[PDB]
Amino acid sequence: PLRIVRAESELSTQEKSYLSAVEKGDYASVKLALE
Amino acid sequence: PLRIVRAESELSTQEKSYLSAVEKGDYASVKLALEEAEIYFKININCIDPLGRTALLIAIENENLEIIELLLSFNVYVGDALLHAIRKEVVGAVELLLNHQFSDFTPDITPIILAAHTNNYEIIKMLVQKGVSVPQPHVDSLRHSRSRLNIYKALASPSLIALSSEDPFLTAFQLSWELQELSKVENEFKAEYEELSHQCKHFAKDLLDQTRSSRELELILNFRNELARLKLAIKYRQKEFVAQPNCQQLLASRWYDRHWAGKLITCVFIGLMFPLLSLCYLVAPKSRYGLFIRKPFIKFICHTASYLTFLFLLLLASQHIVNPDRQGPKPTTVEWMILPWVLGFIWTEIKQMWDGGFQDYIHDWWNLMDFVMNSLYLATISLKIVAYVKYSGCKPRDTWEMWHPTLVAEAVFAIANIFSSLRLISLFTANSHLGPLQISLGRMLLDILKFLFIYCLVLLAFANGLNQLYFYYENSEGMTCKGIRCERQNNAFSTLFETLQSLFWSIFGLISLYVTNVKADHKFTEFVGATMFGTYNVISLVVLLNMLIAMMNNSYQHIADHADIEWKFARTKLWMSYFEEGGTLPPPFNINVRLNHQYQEVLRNLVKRYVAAMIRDAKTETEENFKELKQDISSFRYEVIGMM
Ligand SMILES: Cn1c(=O)n(CCCO)c(=O)c2c1nc(Oc1ccc(/N=N\c3ccccc3)c(OC(F)(F)F)c1)n2Cc1ccc(Cl)cc1
Numbered sequence: 001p002l003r004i005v006r007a008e009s010e011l012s013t014q015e016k017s018y019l020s021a022v023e024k025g026d027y028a029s030v031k032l033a034l035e
Numbered sequence: 036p037l038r039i040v041r042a043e044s045e046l047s048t049q050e051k052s053y054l055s056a057v058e059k060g061d062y063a064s065v066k067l068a069l070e071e072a073e074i075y076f077k078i079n080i081n082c083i084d085p086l087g088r089t090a091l092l093i094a095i096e097n098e099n100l101e102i103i104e105l106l107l108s109f110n111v112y113v114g115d116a117l118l119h120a121i122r123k124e125v126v127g128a129v130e131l132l133l134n135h136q137f138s139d140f141t142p143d144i145t146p147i148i149l150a151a152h153t154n155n156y157e158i159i160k161m162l163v164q165k166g167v168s169v170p171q172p173h174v175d176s177l178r179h180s181r182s183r184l185n186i187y188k189a190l191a192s193p194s195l196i197a198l199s200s201e202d203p204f205l206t207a208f209q210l211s212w213e214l215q216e217l218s219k220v221e222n223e224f225k226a227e228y229e230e231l232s233h234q235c236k237h238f239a240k241d242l243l244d245q246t247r248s249s250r251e252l253e254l255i256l257n258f259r260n261e262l263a264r265l266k267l268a269i270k271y272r273q274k275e276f277v278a279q280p281n282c283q284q285l286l287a288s289r290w291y292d293r294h295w296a297g298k299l300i301t302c303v304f305i306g307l308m309f310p311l312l313s314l315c316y317l318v319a320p321k322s323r324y325g326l327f328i329r330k331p332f333i334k335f336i337c338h339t340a341s342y343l344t345f346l347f348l349l350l351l352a353s354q355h356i357v358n359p360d361r362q363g364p365k366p367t368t369v370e371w372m373i374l375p376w377v378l379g380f381i382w383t384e385i386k387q388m389w390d391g392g393f394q395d396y397i398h399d400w401w402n403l404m405d406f407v408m409n410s411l412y413l414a415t416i417s418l419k420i421v422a423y424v425k426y427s428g429c430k431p432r433d434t435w436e437m438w439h440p441t442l443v444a445e446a447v448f449a450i451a452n453i454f455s456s457l458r459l460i461s462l463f464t465a466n467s468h469l470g471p472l473q474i475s476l477g478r479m480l481l482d483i484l485k486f487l488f489i490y491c492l493v494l495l496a497f498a499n500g501l502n503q504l505y506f507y508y509e510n511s512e513g514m515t516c517k518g519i520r521c522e523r524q525n526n527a528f529s530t531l532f533e534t535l536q537s538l539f540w541s542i543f544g545l546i547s548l549y550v551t552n553v554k555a556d557h558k559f560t561e562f563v564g565a566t567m568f569g570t571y572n573v574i575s576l577v578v579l580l581n582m583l584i585a586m587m588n589n590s591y592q593h594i595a596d597h598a599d600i601e602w603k604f605a606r607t608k609l610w611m612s613y614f615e616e617g618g619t620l621p622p623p624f625n626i627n628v629r630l631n632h633q634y635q636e637v638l639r640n641l642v643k644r645y646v647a648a649m650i651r652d653a654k655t656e657t658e659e660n661f662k663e664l665k666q667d668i669s670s671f672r673y674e675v676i677g678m679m
Contacts, residue, residue, distance in 0.1 A: 002168045003147070003199045005160070007639060025670035028677050 043085075050082050057093050057102055065102050069109045081112045091116045100127050107135060115140075121149050126157050133161070143182045151189035156650060159194050169195075184224060187214065191231055193238050193649070197642050204239055204255075204264075208271045211235035239268075240275040243282070245644040251637045252281055258634050262611070269608060278603040290610050292330045305333065306340030313337065313624050331613040339462060341621035345376040346459075349452055362441060363426030366419065377412045379622035384409055400477075401461050404454060411451035418444035464605045471602045478594045479587055486583050490575065497571040498534040504564055505529065508553040524550050528564070538571060 021029040056064040069080060083089060091111055094102045107113070113132070118140050120128040140149070147167040150158045172186045189195070191210055196203050211232045218228035246252045256265050268276045276282075293301065312333075315324040327333055351357075352369040366374075384405060387396070397403055422440035435442065463473040505528035511517055519527050519537055527537045527550035540546050551565045612618075 001171060002166075003163050003195070004166075005163050006199055006201075008160075024673070025666050026673040026677075027670075028673070 046082055046084065047079070049076070049078050053078060053080075054082075054084055054090070054093065057090050057106075058097065060097065060099050060102065062101050062105065066105055069105070080109070089116075092119060095120050095123060095125060095128050098125060098127075100131070103128055103131060107131060117146055118144065118149055121146055121153060121158055124153055124155050124158065126155075126161075129158055129161065133165075141181065141185070143178065143185060148185055148189040151192040151195050152185075154192045154194050156194050156198070156646065159192075159198060163199065180221070180224070184227070187217075187228075188231060191235050193234075196238065197646055202638070203242060203642060207235050207239045207242075208268065208273060211273075212271050236273060236275050239273060240279060242641055242645055243276065243279060245641045245648070246281060247640075249285075251640075252285065254630075254633060254637055255641075256282065256285070258630070261614075266611070269604075269611070274600050274604045277607050278600040283603060283607075286607060286610055289614065290331050292332065302336055305336050306343075309337040309340050309621060310624070313621050316619060317624070328619055331610065334613050334619060335465070337621050341623050342459075344623070345373070346456060348372060349455070359429065360432040361427075361429040362435070362439075363422045363424070364441075365423065375626070376622055377409075377416075379625035380405070381409050381413070382625060383618075383622065401458060404458065408451050408454040411447050411454070415444050415448040415451060418447065464602065464609055470606065471598050474602045474605060475591070475594045475598050479590055482587060482590050483583065486586075490579060493571075493574060493579070494535070494538055497567065498531065498538055500567055501528045501538070501564065501571075502531050502534045504560065504567070505534075505553075508555070510554060519546060519550070527551075541568070541572060542575065 018030075018033045021033060053065070053068045056068065068076075068078065080090060084093075088096070089112070091103065091106055091113070094106060095116060113135065115138055117129070117132040120132055145167075147159075147162050147169060150162055151169075169190060170186060172183050172190070191214065196206055200206050214228060214232035214235065218225045218232070221228060243252075243255070246255070256262055258264050259267075265277070265282070312324050312328050315321075316328050319325055328337065348369055352367070352373070357367050357369065358364065387402075391397075397406075418440050422444060426440070460473060463469040509526060509529040511526070514523075514525060515521075516523070517526050518524075518533055519540065524547055526533060527546065528534050537546055537550070548565075551568060552561055
């Protein structure tokens with residue numbers, strides 16, 4: 001059989017860095033992204 | 036003794052600092068070590084340590100991704116680090132290792148199989164997003180058996196079922212069954228095949244446990260007449276899927292559709308008036324009194340009362356009032372009101388035949404206990420009808436031959452009342468107190484059957500010995516009776532039949548001690564016979580009946596661990612037989628376009644909630660306290676870097 005991804009989509013290519021910023025924690029980048 | 040190292044070489048001196056640098060985390064030092072222009076520093080970057088880990092293995096062990104990227108940008112050896120990263124479940128390193136002779140992983144282990152073994156939702160999702168295929172399970176018997184087990188161990192992971200399927204319920208049922216029949220045709224990894232099937236039974240229960248409202252639970256259990264999916268789960272022996280509080284409540288609501296003393300009298304009152312409401316089902320199946328019998332609870336009471344009516348007059352067929360002794364008698368009054376019940380039971384069995392075919396129809400105990408009694412009743416009818424037309428005359432009963440057909444018919448009729456009255460215990464799976472007791476009592480009974488094969492050999496051996504010793508002294512001179520079943524027991528060990536009977540009645544102490552004597556002054560043979568009888572008594576009563584207690588006492592504890600999920604399963608099986616028409620008459624009076632879309636939407640909601648719950652539970656569990664330290668350390672480091 002061929003395993004596939006069912007009923008799912010992709011998040012983003014630029015929001016991954018924004019999420020990782022709050023994942024690791026850095027006030028500068030997190031603030032800058034929102035501002 | 037003198038000890039020296041066997042088959043080991045020394046690596047180097049310069050590389051020790053390089054290994055320590057990549058271990059500790061000196062990012063600049065490892066960059067400098069790899070920084071070689073037009074000449075190598077004689078330092079082998081792809082060197083191994085006494086511990087056996089490569090430079091890339093040390094880095095992925097310490098989670099330091101920066102040195103991992105530094106090493107990868109210099110083209111160090113790669114090809115085994117991806118599997119180690121997946122095994123360590125470091126998600127950051129997996130992506131890096133993906134967008135780029137001694138091994139510790141079996142040559143059949145693909146990265147997808149190892150990821151499914153680890154059971155990580157993120158790693159499996161990342162791997163499948165690029166497109167991977169799991170091989171289909173169908174010389175070197177060691178590798179082929181292991182390869183099959185690794186594919187099944189990775190095909191049963193809950194994450195893969197929830198991530199790639201069309202109906203996570205059906206795949207859980209089918210895979211759990213084919214993993215159960217594969218544990219017996221492969222009886223060398225049976226322990227690791229039963230457990231793999233066990234975890235596929237709880238997945239369906241957990242997926243069903245995520246229901247929020249009553250409407251969606253009904254749609255799940257009515258997918259593909261009524262309760263179509265529930266009947267499918269009973270087929271695959273899904274005990275955990277059925278013994279769940281929500282579906283138990285749903286079934287109880289249909290079943291019932293008061294106090295301890297306020298229920299027994301109500302049941303008696305309802306059962307006393309069963310014929311009226313049963314005739315109402317034939318005269319006019321309407322709401323006033325014909326729809327009452329349609330309630331499963333009401334139907335169960337009436338059938339129980341009707342069967343007790345048959346049992347009551349069965350006790351009235353042995354009252355002296357109802358007939359003298361005479362050859363070939365016409366049946367008495369009771370027999371003509373007994374015949375309808377026997378005919379109804381035979382009719383019910385024949386009706387049950389059409390959906391069976393000896394496939395799971397004869398394995399159940401209370402089907403082979405009904406076939407025997409029906410056969411006995413038919414044989415009684417045949418023998419009585421044979422004796423009626425070819426015999427007559429009020430000859431005294433003390434003159435008939437021992438093989439007279441009337442005697443045999445009476446005997447087989449008597450052997451048939453013991454089996455009809457022993458099926459009332461099958462109705463104990465409806466009481467909350469007597470229910471679990473019967474189920475647990477019938478499970479510590481295959482252990483007793485295994486213990487008979489030793490007693491039947493000891494008995495045969497001692498019977499052979501005693502008969503061989505005593506067969507020379509048979510006598511029947513001046514005695515009215517002969518055997519052990521009279522007042523003056525004699526000829527106890529003269530033949531093999533009487534010897535096998537004498538050693539059975541000695542368990543209960545019903546055989547005396549003067550049966551080991553002979554009509555001669557041979558004290559040597561009498562002493563040997565007595566010693567053999569005593570040796571048989573010792574073996575079977577203090578050595579063999581104390582190991583049956585000892586091994587039943589240590590087998591009841593396992594049965595009581597899971598005894599509510601089996602009693603509820605049996606009770607649901609009993610309940611579902613009364614839900615539909617085709618039997619709503621006591622034995623006495625016996626003669627898609629959008630449903631798929633809605634189901635898929637509910638399935639999506641259930642799968643998403645289950646994924647959220649599993650990731651929440653796995654992430655949190657002491658383990659949550661580890662993340663905060665790293666988070667605050669990283670925040671402090673970033674703050675310091677920003678200030679500098
Ligand atoms: C097997 N037998 C026997 O058939 N007859 C009947 C023959 C006469 O009709 C005995 O009379 C007898 C006996 N055995 C005995 O002595 C024992 C008893 C029990 C032992 N052990 N355990 C148990 C365990 C549970 C319950 C009962 C006994 C045991 O253990 C041993 F020493 F290791 F042998 C030895 N006697 C009595 C006797 C007669 C003559 C002498 Cl000189 C000495 C003793």
